[PDB]
Amino acid sequence: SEYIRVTEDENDEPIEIPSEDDGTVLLSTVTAQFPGACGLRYRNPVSQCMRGVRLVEGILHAPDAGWGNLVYVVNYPK
């Protein structure tokens, strides 16, 4: 039952987004909860700077360090 936590505000309580069997997350799993979302970002706990999730053909790839216990934030266009 592996998942990642996604919110549109670190203020708000996040939603649990299930991962696939290969450990990736489908953009479609995110957009079902956050229609219009064009990607994920998180605070790098080392740099304390915001950091992007790799996205290739509707597939979100875990950071090299793994998904971990991080809260991910959705990006929308304007």
Numbering used by the authors: 2 to 79
The publication says:
TDP-43 protein has several functions, and its modular structure facilitates this multitasking. Two centrally located RNA recognition motifs (RRM) strongly bind UG-rich RNA (Lukavsky et al., 2013) or TG-rich DNA (Austin et al., 2014) directing TDP-43 to pre-mRNAs and intronic sites (Tollervey et al., 2011).
The TDP-43 NTD crystallized in space group P212121 with five identical molecules in the asymmetric unit. The NTD adopts a similar conformation as reported in a recent crystallographic structure obtained in P63 space group (Afroz et al., 2017). A sulfate ion binds at the interface between the molecules and is bonded to Arg52 and Arg55, which serves as a wedge, increasing the distance between the monomers. The changes in the position of the monomers against each other alter the superhelical bundle arrangement observed previously (Afroz et al., 2017). Each spiral, with radius of 46 Å, has 10 NTD molecules in a full turn with distance between two rings being ~36 Å. Analysis of the structural changes on sulfate binding confirms that ligand binding at the molecular interface could change the nature of the helical arrangements. These head-to-tail interactions that lead to parallel spirals are consistent with the view that physiological TDP-43 oligomerization is mediated by its NTD and may be key to prevent the formation of pathologic aggregates.
